[PDB]
């Protein structure tokens, strides 16, 4: 995407 | 689009807070793209589309995606968010 991350 | 702000406090689970953050790699800010319905964020009421404004009482609306994520991971067992949420939808 533009910038994705799981947290 | 009118939005309202809300404060949230989320305990870390064993796989994390339970949501995928998404947004500007380098304001407007990062945002919640989806949330584990059985995870800790959902339990605290984070919802998809919630846009990140403050992390632990720090303005984080103008940060890079990785600085925000890293600080989220470094927050320890508890994190606090202030977010902006679409109201009409």
Swiss-Prot record, chain A:
Ranges of compositional bias, category Pro residues: 1-7
Annotated domain remarks: The PDZ-binding motif specifically binds the PDZ domain of SNX27: the specificity for SNX27 is provided by the 2 residues located upstream (Glu-2 and Ser-3) of the PDZ-binding motif.
Lineage top rank: taxon: Eukaryota
Gene it is expressed from: KCNJ9
Quaternary structure, from the entry: Associates with KCNJ3/GIRK1 to form a G-protein-activated heteromultimer pore-forming unit. Interacts (via PDZ-binding motif) with SNX27 (via PDZ domain); the interaction is required when endocytosed to prevent degradation in lysosomes and promote recycling to the plasma membrane.
PDZ-binding (motif): residue ranges: 4-7
Family: Belongs to the inward rectifier-type potassium channel (TC 1.A.2.1) family. KCNJ9 subfamily.
Function: Inward rectifier potassium channels are characterized by a greater tendency to allow potassium to flow into the cell rather than out of it. Their voltage dependence is regulated by the concentration of extracellular potassium; as external potassium is raised, the voltage range of the channel opening shifts to more positive voltages. The inward rectification is mainly due to the blockage of outward current by internal magnesium, This receptor is controlled by G proteins. Unable to produce channel activity when expressed alone. Forms a functional channel in association with KCNJ3/GIRK1.
UniProt-recorded name of the protein: G protein-activated inward rectifier potassium channel 3
Subcellular location as annotated: Membrane
Organism: Homo sapiens (Human)
